[PDB]
Structure 1
Amino acid sequence: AKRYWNANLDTYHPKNVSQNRALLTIRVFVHNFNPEEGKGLTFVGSPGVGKTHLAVATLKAIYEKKGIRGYFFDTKDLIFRLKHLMDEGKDTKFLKTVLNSPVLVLDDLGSERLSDWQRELISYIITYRYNNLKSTIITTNYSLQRSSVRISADLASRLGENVVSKIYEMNELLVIK
């Protein structure tokens, strides 16, 4: 939660054209935000680049100018949590509040490779939020450099074609450099 205590659309000081465009987009996005549209953003990019900073920021600006409460998860942390209350088998309540969330930040959704069972949980959670028009914000890592659709196949390679295709029809792509 709070290495990003300070994370605000407002500390925000962009340092290249990438970051400025990203901040403009985010601003427009938050201002027209409608839990109902199930629209989101995807932040790609090498690391230490302020992708996650911007996603926390986006989540805050939402509920500051729209009073809607999001949720912020490290994708692996979420998955790991869920598998464990899902085979202890008791809590359907955590799963439901995560799936039905009006805004959800899946930080690092899928950088690195995901074993069959984490793959299954992601596909589930994304199929659900896709079907139910639930706005979902994603940050993922991309590294080899000079776009659109390689970023597609690269993401597709550890997430699956299916999840990535859906991610695209829900989210606008913001490459931060």
Structure 2
Amino acid sequence: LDVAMAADDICTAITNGEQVKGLYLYGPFGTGKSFILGAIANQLKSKKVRSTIIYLPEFIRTLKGGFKDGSFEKKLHRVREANILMLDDIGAEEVTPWVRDEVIGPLLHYRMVHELPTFFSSNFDYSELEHHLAMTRDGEEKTKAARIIERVKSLSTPYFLSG
């Protein structure tokens, strides 16, 4: 499939005002998923449309700066209402029950309830990401992973990138 034209068309749509689904780019490392996300971002910027790109490892490691006091909700509440959000390299973060049920879950829930374009990039497809989310130190919790992954599916359109 041609991801370039999907990116171009979703840029035109976003700039026109149409409600659209983000892109779920998945594939092995070094296939250009991040570059396509950033290309969408710069393309939108060329038309004055803002967007927010997040590298999930660093972002979660930043939210852990205040997991005790609960001040992480300060930044989460700011990132969750972003007009266009792009979660870069989801599924690579350390899947802990806290990040799954207090960061990722709520984030995607809100961005869905308000229909806000959400782009993704991952080394896993939908089901593989669901398995990644279910497994954790507390064991396999399939219902939470199913809820989250269904949010992802309803927020994005899949595209496979290979070498």
TM-score computed with the length of structure 2 as normaliser: 0.82
The answer to whether the Cα contact below 8 Å between 1:38 and 1:136 also exists between their aligned partners in 2 is no
Q: Give the whole-Å Cα distance in 1 for the aligned partners of 2:69 and 2:20.
A: 31
Judged with a 3 Å threshold, the aligned counterparts in structure 2 of structure 1 residues 36 and 87 are, in CA distance, closer, same or farther, namely farther
- Matched with 2:160 is 175
Q: Give the whole-Å Cα distance in 2 for the aligned partners of 1:22 and 1:53.
A: 11
- Matched with 2:99 is 118
Q: Give the whole-Å Cα distance in 2 for the aligned partners of 1:86 and 1:38.
A: 33
- Matched with 1:155 is 129
Query: What SS is found at the alignment partner of 2:115?
Result: coil
1:141 to 2:141 alignment: no
How many matched pairs? Answer: 149
In the TM superposition, 1:28-47 aligns within 5 A as 28-33=9-14, 37=19, 39-47=21-29
**Percent identical:** 22
Judged with a 3 Å threshold, the aligned counterparts in structure 2 of structure 1 residues 153 and 89 are, in CA distance, closer, same or farther, namely closer
The answer to whether the Cα contact below 8 Å between 1:74 and 1:106 also exists between their aligned partners in 2 is yes
1:127 to 2:101 alignment: no
1:22 to 2:7 alignment: no
Output the amino acid matched with 2:77.
K
Output the amino acid matched with 1:174.
Y
Judged with a 3 Å threshold, the aligned counterparts in structure 2 of structure 1 residues 163 and 48 are, in CA distance, closer, same or farther, namely same
CA offset at residue 38 of structure 1? 5.8
Judged with a 3 Å threshold, the aligned counterparts in structure 2 of structure 1 residues 48 and 37 are, in CA distance, closer, same or farther, namely same
Q: Give the whole-Å Cα distance in 1 for the aligned partners of 2:5 and 2:116.
A: 22
1:83 to 2:64 alignment: yes
Q: Cα deviation per residue 1:114-154 (whole Å; 9 max; x = unaligned)?
A: 01111121111111111111111110003xxxxxxxx3321
TM-score computed with the length of structure 1 as normaliser: 0.76
Q: Cα deviation per residue 1:7-52 (whole Å; 9 max; x = unaligned)?
A: xxxxxxxxxxx4xx00011101110116773621111000011111
Query: What SS is found at the alignment partner of 2:90?
Result: coil
The answer to whether the Cα contact below 8 Å between 1:100 and 1:129 also exists between their aligned partners in 2 is yes
Query: What SS is found at the alignment partner of 2:50?
Result: coil
Q: Give the whole-Å Cα distance in 1 for the aligned partners of 2:111 and 2:158.
A: 17
